[PDB]
Design a protein around this ligand. Structure first.
Ligand SMILES: C#Cc1oc2ccc(C)cc2c1CC(=O)O
Ligand SMILES: C#Cc1oc2ccc(C)cc2c1CC(=O)O
Lengths: 138, 138
C-alpha cells in the first residue's frame, strides 16, 4: 500500500503523479492549480482502485489542505512526510506523443499508458502494471 | 480484458461507468456532457491501468465519435456492440454519502470506493477490487 505523491509542470499546467513504490506503476492527472480539493479528489480515486495505506510527500503543501486531511481520514490513508527520474522519463515519453494529441492531458495519459505497459529495456520480465497486480495478488 | 461501458445521470450531470464484467469492479467519472473526447479520455486512462481488450456498449453513440475511434485504435481496445442494477446500487451508495461531499463527483468516487472495497453481504469472500487483481494475476 505504499505510494509517493509529487507534482510536476508542463505548458503551465500541473500534473499530479502517484507512484506505487515497489512496482513503479504511475497514475497521473492534469489539475487546475495545485488545490487541496483536486489532490483530495485524486487521492480518493486512487484509494478506491488500489490498496492505498501510506502516501509519502517531500514538502508541506499537502499537510495544509483541510480537504486532503478529510480524504486521508475518510479512505484510511496515512499521510507521511519524507521520501526515502520518474518525472523526467514521463516527460521524454510526453514529447514523443505530444503532437498525436490536442490536449496536454491526453499526452500525459498516453505517457502513463506506455510507462505502465512497457517492459524495462523493451523485452522480458514484467511491466509496472503487471508488477503492481502481482504484488497485490501476493 | 472484458468491460461494459454505460453512462448514467444525477443532478443533471453525466456519470461514465466502466464495469469489469468477471469481477464487478467499477470505475466512474463525472464528465461535461457525453462528448466523444471525454469518453475517449476515460477509455485511454482505464486501458493504461488495467488490460482493456474489449469494451461492450448497448447503443450507437460510441460508434459515432472520431476520438473514441482513435482512442480504441491507439490503445488496442475492440469496440463491440451488445451487452449479453449496477447503475442502481451505486446510486443507493451515492445517496448515503451525498451530504458528506460538496461535489457530486466526490460522492460518485466515495460510492465507487465502497462498491469496490465492500464484501458481498458484508462478510467473507472477496471485494470487486480484490477479484479484478486476482483474475489478472491469474
Ligand atoms: C473536488 C473535490 C473533493 O475530493 C474529495 C475527496 C474526499 C473527501 C472527504 C472530500 C473531497 C472533495 C470536496 C467535496 O466535494 O466535499
Ligand atoms: C479530451 C480528450 C482526448 O482523449 C483521448 C484519448 C486517445 C486519443 C488518441 C485522443 C484523445 C483526446 C483528444 C486529443 O487530446 O487529441
Amino acid at each position: 500500500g505504499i505510494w509517493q505523491l509529487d507534482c510536476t509542470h508542463l505548458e503551465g499546467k500541473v500534473i499530479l503523479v502517484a507512484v506505487h513504490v515497489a512496482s513503479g506503476y504511475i497514475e497521473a492527472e492534469v489539475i487546475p492549480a495545485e488545490t487541496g480539493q483536486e489532490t483530495a479528489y485524486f487521492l480518493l480515486k486512487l484509494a478506491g482502485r488500489w490498496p492505498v495505506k501510506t502516501v509519502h510527500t517531500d514538502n508541506g503543501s499537502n499537510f495544509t489542505s483541510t480537504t486532503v486531511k478529510a480524504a486521508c481520514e475518510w479512505a484510511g490513508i496515512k499521510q507521511e512526510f519524507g521520501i526515502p527520474s520518474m518525472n523526467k522519463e514521463l516527460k521524454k515519453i510526453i514529447g514523443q506523443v505530444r503532437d498525436q494529441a490536442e490536449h496536454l492531458k491526453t499526452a500525459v495519459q498516453m505517457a502513463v499508458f506506455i510507462h505502465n505497459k512497457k517492459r524495462k529495456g523493451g523485452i522480458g520480465g514484467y511491466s509496472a502494471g503487471e508488477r503492481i497486480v502481482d504484488i497485490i495478488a501476493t
